[PDB]
Amino acid sequence: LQDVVNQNAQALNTLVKQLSSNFGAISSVLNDILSRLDPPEAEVQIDRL
Partner 1 sequence: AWNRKRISNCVADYSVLYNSASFSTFKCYGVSPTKLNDLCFTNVYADSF
Cβ contacts of 20 within 8 Å, gap of 6 or more: 28
CA distance 45 to 25: 5
Kindly tell me which residue out of 4, 16, 24, 38 binds partner 1, with binding defined by CB under 8 A. 38
Kindly tell me which residue out of 36, 43, 46, 47 binds partner 1, with binding defined by CB under 8 A. 36
Q: Which stretch binds partner 1 (CB under 8 A): 3-11, 16-24, 37-45?
A: 37-45
Cβ contacts of 21 within 8 Å, gap of 6 or more: 28
Binding of partner 1 by 48 (CB under 8 A): no
Q: Which stretch binds partner 1 (CB under 8 A): 6-14, 15-23, 33-41?
A: 33-41
